[PDB]
Symmetry: D2
Subunit: 113 residues, 4 copies
């Protein structure tokens, strides 16, 4: 299945926060309506915080991509809703063979405010 | 039900990252075996990143507390596992009456490496 | 926080399946726009299947209630989305003191077809 | 990523419940330590309940397979934990091209009792 693709409510601010747990440099891109709006880059094996940004969801079509030196990683994702209000969309990824799936991570949350 | 309580694997590094979406100052505490090991403090209504830290899970007993000026907030939480390997534990909280449950948020992830 | 409340897409068929893991008779009600549309009743401590039904979501306002002989149980819930398409909404409940939260369970899934 | 694979606690009873939302006959197998312990078979496009069974988790290694006339479907899965106690493991699958991922579904829950 396609992973890293999420439908958000339209025209809604959301936070996205990216991490590495990898020896290799991760490139984590956040696309809104197929346009890259944020890119997070780095490495480190202890939950290196690569950055956190607030973006508008546009039509609501979000796609997260993770790659290492142009090679796409294998993604896994889901979305969970707490209290029928608080949304998290999580992306992990595997750049190698150990299948820890933590190499490049994105966490999205909404609504803000 | 009790919320914000999670059983992690013992003696395992995990990341915890905290956010505010609130006018009021949030105090987000991370307890490992009933001992506060990290405290994140601040306010802001656009997913203000309060900090991110890596901690050892001790016996595995983790509890997240959120309060505003000593008054405990109402918490909501869960844990989700992707690819039978990548764990996220999420905590939201409500300090008021609008029931957005985003006022003080913690996201935990493991394993690292 | 309120638990057992979910916003579904409007005018959409969904499945709801109920279980007991309890010595006491569970009453599990499914409300659509505040109207009870299904009721599941029974006991048994080995995941007794109480029934499964397909309902229309109406406006999308779903609420699950669980009670034992008229006394509301303590509910816990969330919603998770797989492949940006397949939705599950889960409800557990505690009628007593052992805090297994499995006493009366509802699982909702959509879309069908 | 591998999907449909879950690590349960060892020697623990769990429930598994299977559904179809498909024109084609689904075959949903539940393996415990690589041994098929339950098989659910059928079709129907309105959340047809194919069956529900309680099994022992053995070492804890569970794998769900879904196929149509011997052809493996594309699986998606995750696991979620409520109240730090109630576990659900969900599997959806796609046998075709419409990518509804609802064609053959398994829901596992534990602990029972
Ligand atoms: C050296 O091992 C690490 O780095 C590689 C490459 O990034 C990852 O796949 C792996 O999980 C570890 O984090
Ligand atoms: C002024 O409204 C905001 O601040 C209060 C108090 O922190 C929160 O409960 C609320 O959701 C908003 O974020
Ligand atoms: C006798 O113990 C059982 O029944 C009670 C009452 O229903 C439940 O709370 C409990 O978890 C067990 O399933
Ligand atoms: C005819 O369409 C249905 O049946 C096919 C084959 O099973 C599924 O893939 C599809 O989602 C529908 O449920
Ligand atoms: Ca890896
Ligand atoms: Ca790694
Ligand atoms: Ca609030
Ligand atoms: Ca808020
Ligand atoms: Ca109980
Ligand atoms: Ca019980
Ligand atoms: Ca299909
Ligand atoms: Ca289908």
């Amino acid at each position: 299945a396609q992973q890293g693709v999420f439908t958000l409510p339209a025209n809604t601010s959301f936070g996205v926060t990216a991490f590495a747990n990898a020896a290799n440099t991760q490139t984590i891109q956040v696309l809104v309506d197929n346009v890259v709006k944020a890119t997070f880059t780095g490495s480190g094996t202890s939950d290196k915080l690569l950055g956190s940004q607030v973006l508008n969801s546009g039509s609501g079509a979000i796609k997260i991509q993770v790659s290492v030196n142009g090679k796409p990683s294998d993604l896994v994702s889901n979305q969970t809703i707490l209290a029928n209000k608080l949304n998290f969309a999580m992306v992990g990824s595997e750049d190698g063979t150990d299948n820890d799936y933590n190499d490049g991570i994105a966490v999205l949350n909404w609504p803000l405010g």
